Design a protein around this nucleic acid. Structure first.
Ligand SMILES: N[C@@H](Cc1c[nH]c2ccccc12)C(=O)O
Ligand SMILES: [Mg+2]
Ligand SMILES: [Mg+2]
Ligand SMILES: [Mg+2]
Ligand SMILES: [Mg+2]
Ligand SMILES: [Mg+2]
Ligand SMILES: [Mg+2]
Ligand SMILES: [Mg+2]
Ligand SMILES: [Mg+2]
Ligand SMILES: [Mg+2]
Ligand SMILES: [Mg+2]
Ligand SMILES: [Mg+2]
Ligand SMILES: [Mg+2]
Ligand SMILES: [Mg+2]
Ligand SMILES: [Mg+2]
Ligand SMILES: [Mg+2]
Ligand SMILES: [Mg+2]
Ligand SMILES: [Mg+2]
Ligand SMILES: [Mg+2]
Ligand SMILES: [Mg+2]
Ligand SMILES: [Mg+2]
Ligand SMILES: [Mg+2]
Ligand SMILES: [Mg+2]
Ligand SMILES: [Mg+2]
Ligand SMILES: [Mg+2]
Ligand SMILES: [Mg+2]
Ligand SMILES: [Mg+2]
Ligand SMILES: [Mg+2]
Ligand SMILES: [Mg+2]
Ligand SMILES: [Mg+2]
Ligand SMILES: [Mg+2]
Ligand SMILES: [Mg+2]
Ligand SMILES: [Mg+2]
Ligand SMILES: [Mg+2]
Ligand SMILES: [Mg+2]
Ligand SMILES: [Mg+2]
Ligand SMILES: [Mg+2]
Ligand SMILES: [Mg+2]
Ligand SMILES: [Mg+2]
Ligand SMILES: [Mg+2]
Ligand SMILES: [Mg+2]
Ligand SMILES: [Mg+2]
Ligand SMILES: [Mg+2]
Ligand SMILES: [Mg+2]
Ligand SMILES: [Mg+2]
Ligand SMILES: [Mg+2]
Lengths: 271, 46, 17
RNA sequence: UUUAAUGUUUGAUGUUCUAACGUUGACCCGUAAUCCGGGUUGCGGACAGUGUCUGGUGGGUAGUUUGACUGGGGCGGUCUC
RNA sequence: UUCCUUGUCGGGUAAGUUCCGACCUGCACGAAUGGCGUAAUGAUGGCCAGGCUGUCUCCACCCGAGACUCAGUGAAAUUG
RNA sequence: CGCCGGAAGACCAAGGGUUCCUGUCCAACGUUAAUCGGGGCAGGGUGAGUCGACCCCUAAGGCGAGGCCGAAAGGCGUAGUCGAUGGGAAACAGGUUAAUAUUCCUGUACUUGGUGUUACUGCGAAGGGGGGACGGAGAAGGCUAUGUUGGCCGGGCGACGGUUGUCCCGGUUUAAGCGUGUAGGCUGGUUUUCCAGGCAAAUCCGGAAAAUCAAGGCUGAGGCGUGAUGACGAGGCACUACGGUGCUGAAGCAACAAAUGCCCUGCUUCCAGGAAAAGCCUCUAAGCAUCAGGUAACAUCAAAUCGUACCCCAAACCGACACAGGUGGUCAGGUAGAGAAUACCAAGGCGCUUGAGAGAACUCGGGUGAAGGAACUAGGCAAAAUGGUGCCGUAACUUCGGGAGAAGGCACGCUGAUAUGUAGGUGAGGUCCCUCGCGGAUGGAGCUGAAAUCAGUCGAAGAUACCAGCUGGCUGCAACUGUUUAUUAAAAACACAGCACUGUGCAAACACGAAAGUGGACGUAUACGGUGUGACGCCUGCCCGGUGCCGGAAGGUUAAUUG
RNA sequence: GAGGACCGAACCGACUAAUGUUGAAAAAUUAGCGGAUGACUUGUGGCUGGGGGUGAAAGGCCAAUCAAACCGGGAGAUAG
C-alpha cells in the first residue's frame, strides 16, 4: 500500500510513503544486533573518499544470515521486521531446535510459514538449495557466487535472478542488470523474489527527507570555479566542454570495467 | 566578539605537552633545539 | 597595526579609474 | 618457374592438464584473535598480476613562452634590399 | 534579451523615458547550459491606490547629553 | 531619593591563581582627590569513608608486541592498552569563624571491604545466559516544590478627618534514614518429562508436550508513623569594644490553587527504526573434595591520596585597558498577564572612579505642532499610523490544503441584581457497607469560581499605561522551508524533492594511498558513483557534416624486438 | 494530534536606517527585522594539513593573515 499525503504543508504535498501493516511494531531481537557507527565517507587517512555522505539517523546492525547453512532443520517464520540497513525487510525465523535467525524476507512470506534449507528441501519460496537441484527456469534470489561464501546477487527489494541454462559444472544466470553470467552449480540460491517490491514507488517529498538517510547535497561542477572542477568558470552560464568527472575522466559513455580475471564468467554484457 | 584563543588545559597538554613532543621524531627535534638555545621552559607544561 | 579604514575602502581610494 | 613425400621443428591458433602463481571460498592449528603465518581441501591456472623496454593517449599536473616601432596603448600598417 | 528607441497603438495621470495590455520590423528568444504557464511562499525587483504623517511647502517651540566657563588630569595625526 | 529584579540576585563547570580575611601605608597604579582599593608591605585562611578527582568500565578516536608494507625516516593494523563529554557503593538537618564547611561541632544515619568466631552448605572462569540498555512527538491522570486565604499565636490602637474591628503588622519551619505499601505500569502462575540450539558442559537461557491453579510476581511517586519530650522559632530581657554577645521563648494548623519538577527509561503513536562494556544476577568446565570456597549472624579493623580560599554574564576568564563586546549548566517569589513577554515590586545587589556652573550657534536622542498632505526624493528613506479578545462577515484564483487575521464591523470600565458568589472544580463531618483499610457508597458543610444577561453610573476617551499586523490592485524572477561572500553584495545565485543520460556483476566502478590497506559497504543493479536539469501542469521539434564517446575489422601506415 | 505547519520570548541569525569612523568596540550600539520541533541549536572530546584540507560554491574558510597559511633555512635570491 502506497499512500499519497495531503498537502497541508508545502513539504507534504509530494510525499508518497509506503506503509506495510505487517511489520513488527516493537523492538528487534537483541541477541542479533550490533553497533554500527557512521563514517562520513572518510577512510583511515581521515580523508573524504566518497562524496555526499554524512549525518543521518542512528542505526543498529542486524546480523542477517546470508549463508543459510543450517541444513535439514525446518524453521518457522516468527515475524517480519524493519531493517534500516537495507531496502528489503527481514524475517525472524525460529528453528526446530530453538535457534533464531534473520533472513531476507521473500515475497509472499508471512508469519507462520515453514522454510527449510539444504539439498532435500522442497521447491517453495524461502527454501534454499544448491543450484544443481533447482529446475532450469526457476526464479531465485540471494545467489552465491563462491560455494560456502554467502549470497551476494539479487538482494535488494523486488529483485530476482533467472536460471537460464545448466551445462555440466556451471549454470547460466540472467542477472537483474540484463547481464548473462556463469556460476558454479554448487552455489546456493533461495526460491522466489525479494519482498517489498513497492520500495521504488516512494517519493521523499522534501530536501530534509534525504538528509535523514545520510545523503548530503550535491554541488554541480558547472557552478564552481576552474580551480575546483574541470567544468568551473564562466561569465554567466557557460559549458563548452565535454562532460567529465571531478578528476577529469570522461563521463556519459566511457566504459570503466577492466577486470581480466573474471571475463571468462561473463557470457554477455548488459544491453 | 568570540576571539581565537579559548583556553583549555587538557587540549593545551595533549597538543603541545612534553609527552606529545616525545611521541614523534620531529617533536624530539623541537626539544633538541630548545635545549640548544637554552630555553628556561621547554614546553607548555605545569 | 593595519591601514586606516578610508585608505582601504575602494570607494574613497578608486575615485579616478 | 611450380610442387609433393618422408624426417625435423621454426612459429601461430586451438584443446586438454597441473606443478609455478592467485584466492577479499571452507575447515584445522598457533590462539583468549574477522591481522598474519602454517596445514588440508575446492575453484581458477600458465591466464591474471608485477619488473625492464616500447608505441598511443594524456591541461590530471609542471616549467615556461606569447617582438619592436607607434604624436599614450590597442586595432591597422611596417621591419631587408 | 530590442541597438535604432522615449518604436507604434491602447490604459492609467492635468502632464507617465518608468508600469500594464497589445502589435511583430526577434540588431542579437526558443525547447532538460530546458520552452511556456502556474496556486502558495519571498527582510526579492518594478508600478499604482487608500490610510497616515515635519518627507516637504517652511519651519517654530520645548526636554535631556555634548559644545561654552571654572577646578583636576591630560592625548593625536602633522611639521624645511 | 533613584535603578535591576528569567537580573545588574544566588550557586557552579571551564579559565585564572591568592584577587579571599585582618592590620598597616598612599611614592607609582586607579583616566580627578583619596583617609579608599582587585595597589604596596606583613600576618592569617582552604579540615571529607559519603562532594569531585583518582579508581572499575567502555564510545569516537589514539598508541600498538608479533605482523603485512615501505629508498631510510616510516605507514597501516591483530592480540592488547589508553581515552568521557556517558555507565558504576554510600549523609542529612541544625550550629559555628574576620575568613572553611554535606569537610569542623551536636543529633540521627548509611556503604563497601578485610580479619576472626558460631551455624549450615558444592565452590569454581579469560567461558554460556539475563540485565545494564537507551528514538521523535503527543496526551493526559496522580502528586509535590511553591504560593494565596482563613484559623492560631505575639504585638498595636496611630504626627491630619476616622480607626475595639468584617481593623493593622509579624510569625505559623523542621531533613536524610528507618517502617508501611498506595494512584498508576508490565507480566499468566506452578510442577514434571523431553531436545539436531547457546564453540565444550550446564540444574541457567531457548524450544516441545502434558497436567494443574486463577491468581502470583516485579516496579512505583506521594501521603502517613517515627526521626523529633529534639532543633528552630516572633519577640522579650541582661550587657557591650555599640560590632555584637549572653539568657529566655509563644503558635507552629486547615482549605484551595499549582508546575516546564516527580510517577515517567511509563503510556499512545510515527518512521527516519533510535550507544558500548563493566559493576550486578545466574549456569556450569578444568580443578578442589572433612580442604578451599559459599551463605547468614555477631565482633572488630579499615576506607588511603589529591582538590576544597576567592571571581565565575565578570574590574579576577577571552578581548593590549578596571574595555558599552563574547562566555556552558542549576535556581525561578508577588500583583496584573497566555506567558520565562511587559510594567511596578520582594529576597538580594547597586547608583556605572572627574565634578561645579551656565542655559548661544551647531551636532546627537526625543516631545508637540496651525492649513495642506508625498507637492520631498533616485525611491514614502526615515517617521507617523495599524495593533487585543469575543462574535458577525469575507472576492478573484486554486495544486481544493489554501488565499484568510482577506477586506470590513460591532461589544469592551465600575456598581447592583439574576445568584447575600451562579455554571463548574474540590470536597469535611455524618451515616451505610465490607475487604477493616492509604477501601467503597451516600452526603453535602467549607473553600474556589468563570462567562453571560438586565438595570444603573462616570469621563473627551473603558483593548485607557507598558505590550501589541498598515491594507488593497497589477506584474518580472525563483516552486516552496533552507544555504552563501566571518569584516561594504542574502540575491534572480547555491541547495532541493522530482527528471534523464551514463558508468558499475562485487576483490564493483570510483576515491585516499611508491605499497599494505581503508572508504564505497558489513551495501549487491528497486544498489552505488558521475554528469546535467530543477516542485507541479502542457510539452521537449530538425541536424551525426565538426569535436567527443561507442562498435567494427578488411585493407594502408606503424615501436621496442630479430638481423 | 500530523506538520523542513502558524503567531511569538529565551536561543541562533543579520534585512533597513541613524550614530561611531584618532571609536565604548581592528565590525559594535540604538530602534525596528528573519527562523524559532528542525536541512535547528549548543557544551565537551576527537579526525582531515598547504598545490593540501574542507566547502548547500562566495575563490569562501584553514588562529584579526589566504588566486596557495605560518615559522625557520637556501639567502646578502634577482632588481637594465
Ligand atoms: N568604517 C567602519 C568599517 C570598517 C572597518 N575597517 C574598514 C576598512 C575599510 C572600509 C571600512 C572599514 C569602521 O571604521 O569601523
Ligand atoms: Mg553523490
Ligand atoms: Mg541530484
Ligand atoms: Mg561562482
Ligand atoms: Mg582545470
Ligand atoms: Mg552569456
Ligand atoms: Mg599550465
Ligand atoms: Mg625558472
Ligand atoms: Mg611598444
Ligand atoms: Mg509590455
Ligand atoms: Mg537562452
Ligand atoms: Mg541560445
Ligand atoms: Mg532538444
Ligand atoms: Mg539544450
Ligand atoms: Mg580645564
Ligand atoms: Mg524599578
Ligand atoms: Mg598580590
Ligand atoms: Mg578584599
Ligand atoms: Mg591620583
Ligand atoms: Mg591588596
Ligand atoms: Mg581502561
Ligand atoms: Mg566564603
Ligand atoms: Mg486623628
Ligand atoms: Mg569604570
Ligand atoms: Mg566588561
Ligand atoms: Mg548564551
Ligand atoms: Mg523582563
Ligand atoms: Mg539645549
Ligand atoms: Mg501639521
Ligand atoms: Mg491639523
Ligand atoms: Mg514626485
Ligand atoms: Mg520604512
Ligand atoms: Mg519587465
Ligand atoms: Mg527563506
Ligand atoms: Mg559581507
Ligand atoms: Mg549584508
Ligand atoms: Mg539551473
Ligand atoms: Mg575506436
Ligand atoms: Mg515552522
Ligand atoms: Mg552566516
Ligand atoms: Mg538588535
Ligand atoms: Mg516565529
Ligand atoms: Mg568570481
Ligand atoms: Mg581569518
Ligand atoms: Mg643561493
Ligand atoms: Mg636583498
Amino acid at each position: 500500500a502506497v499512500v499519497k499525503c495531503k498537502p497541508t504543508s508545502p513539504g507534504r504535498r509530494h510525499v508518497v510513503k509506503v506503509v506495510n501493516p505487517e511489520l513488527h511494531k516493537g523492538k528487534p531481537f537483541a541477541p542479533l544486533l550490533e553497533k554500527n557507527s557512521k563514517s562520513g565517507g572518510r577512510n583511515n587517512n581521515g580523508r573524504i573518499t566518497t562524496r555526499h555522505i554524512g549525518g543521518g539517523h542512528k542505526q543498529a546492525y542486524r546480523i542477517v544470515d546470508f549463508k543459510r547453512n543450517k541444513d535439514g532443520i525446518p524453521a518457522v517464520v516468527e515475524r517480519l521486521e524493519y531493517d534500516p540497513n537495507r531496502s528489503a525487510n527481514i524475517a525472524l525465523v525460529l528453528y526446530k531446535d530453538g535457534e533464531r535467525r534473520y533472513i531476507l524476507a521473500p515475497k509472499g512470506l508471512k508469519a507462520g510459514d515453514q522454510i527449510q534449507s539444504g539439498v532435500d528441501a522442497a521447491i517453495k519460496p524461502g527454501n534454499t538449495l544448491p543450484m544443481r537441484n533447482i529446475p532450469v527456469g526457476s526464479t531465485v534470489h540471494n545467489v552465491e557466487m563462491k560455494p560456502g561464501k554467502g549470497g551476494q546477487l539479487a538482494r535488494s527489494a523486488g529483485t530476482y535472478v533467472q536460471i537460464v541454462a545448466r551445462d555440466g559444472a556451471y549454470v547460466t544466470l540472467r542477472l537483474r542488470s540484463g547481464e548473462m553470467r556463469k556460476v558454479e552449480a554448487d552455489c546456493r540460491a533461495t526460491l522466489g523474489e525479494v519482498g517489498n517490491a513497492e520500495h521504488m514507488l516512494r517519493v521523499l517529498g522534501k530536501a530534509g527527507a534525504a538528509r535523514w538517510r545520510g545523503v548530503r547535497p550535491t554541488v554541480r561542477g558547472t557552478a564552481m570555479n576552474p580551480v575546483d572542477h574541470p567544468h568551473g568558470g564562466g561569465e554567466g552560464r557557460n559549458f563548452g566542454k565535454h562532460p567529465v568527472t571531478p578528476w577529469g575522466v570522461q563521463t556519459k559513455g566511457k566504459k570503466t570495467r577492466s577486470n581480466k580475471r573474471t571475463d571468462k564468467f561473463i557470457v554477455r554484457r548488459r544491453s | 566578539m568570540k576571539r581565537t584563543f579559548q583556553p583549555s588545559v587538557l587540549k593545551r597538554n595533549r597538543s603541545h605537552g612534553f609527552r606529545a613532543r616525545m611521541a614523534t621524531k620531529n617533536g624530539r627535534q623541537v626539544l633538541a633545539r630548545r635545549r640548544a638555545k637554552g630555553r628556561a621552559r621547554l614546553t607548555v607544561s605545569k | 597595526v593595519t591601514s586606516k579604514w578610508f585608505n582601504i575602502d575602494n570607494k574613497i581610494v578608486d575615485h579616478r579609474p
